[PDB]
Symmetry: none
Subunit: 144 residues, 4 copies
């Protein structure tokens, strides 16, 4: 239906592909971050924010995807092909799920506008030659 | 996280268990209903509602599950296990997806209060033994 | 006709003749930057700014150059000559296209006066011998050099 | 990006496709006209108009395409292949350029409204079967 999960939040898949795929933290690290920071609000019966809603739906999505993959792996008999399918699922869906988690957690934690500024700035940075840019990479921080 | 995608709205996976699994329309029918009624809002850059947000996320998740299953089947060469895995996918994930789509499209069309009262009344109807069960089951409708 | 594409914006080829080719990101990097930052406006039916106009025109003719060079290389048979013509097109036209894209993007981002002041200072720096100039070139960035967003 | 260089003005590549390819004057003719009529404004340090901006960019990048094609043909071993490459560059890049120059010069000279109405009228004229097609093809004119 030509739906972009970010354009209601002011971002785009083009803007999140503006960053390297090797930048987004792992899905385990991000789920741990969520469980630590916003578990009581995600398990809550409240529309605390569209970020909370999308994060809930995304977590359930990953649950279903992992269930399917684990089931077919259990039912299959070649670890080689199991490795192939897990490589595919990671490379394709795992990156998209990491971008979805990162975006929403970072939004809740810092600011939607701050996260978009960070996207564009880090893109321009990693694209600019080192000798003519700030030497240390940008980073989001709550500590003043 | 033990997230329930319905208590954020006012329902639960045990309140929707009042409806059987053979009650929910096909994913094709429900996606057609969506494309017909709320495409302009699902493709919109606005948080028109939590129902819209959840429906977008779910549609994307379904596109993703179908991508995975299609890639798998295509890389596969045996028809029996392929039909078996697609049957498992349909049953489990398609049923959860149908529940989600039905709930959200109905809460957008008829209202959440009406949908929950309908769930309660249909639970009464389907619990009533058939000998004392009226034939005119409850149905969501804007007309008499 | 002896036209200067930057004279309309207050710069010149002599003011950008100092920036080395080591200074401008790749054409793909700059095109991705544009597609991510100002796509909604470059694909718009409005004259949002002369920078947008020039950027659209530059992107179009760069695509034209690329079609030409691709067709030529494909119709050539020796990879030696293919890479020779590719190196020529890079060193000659890609540098100018990166120059233009950088100028316009950096203008739209920071400010025309800011970009021109940066060019003046970078010229002062790159004209100065290394034994007498600081080792860290001047920098144009939307961030503080601490690079920590809060 | 799907940039259309005429959209910011009000035309499209499907509106200029109304005019054939053999309709647009030669790059030499259009450059001579541009010089004679707006040299002082194209060499000027002013955003005199988006038409001026686009025309400057076009002229410069065409000079660049010409440098590339000249260098290629020179370093090319066979003049018979030089003719092939010059034919290709003309057919594609030269035609697209003569459409870009014509559009902008004709706008800057007569009016963007006039140029778009002329595109529509020429579409009518060229769609009309010849038995009922006037020989007086539409033409842009001030007097």
């Amino acid at each position: 239906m030509d739906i972009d999960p970010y354009k209601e939040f002011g971002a785009t898949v083009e803007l999140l592909s503006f960053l390297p795929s090797d930048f987004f933290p792992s899905v385990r690290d991000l789920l741990d971050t969520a469980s630590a920071l916003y578990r009581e609000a995600l398990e809550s019966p409240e529309h605390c924010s569209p970020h909370h809603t999308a994060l809930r739906q995304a977590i359930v999505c990953w649950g279903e995807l992992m269930t399917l993959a684990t089931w077919v792996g259990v039912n299959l008999e070649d670890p080689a092909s199991r490795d192939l399918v897990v490589s595919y699922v990671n490379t394709n869906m795992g990156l998209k799920f990491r971008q979805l988690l990162w975006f929403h957690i970072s939004c809740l934690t810092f600011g939607r506008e701050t996260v978009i500024e960070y996207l564009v700035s880090f893109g321009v940075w990693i694209r600019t030659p080192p000798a003519y840019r700030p030497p240390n990479a940008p980073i989001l921080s709550t500590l003043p």
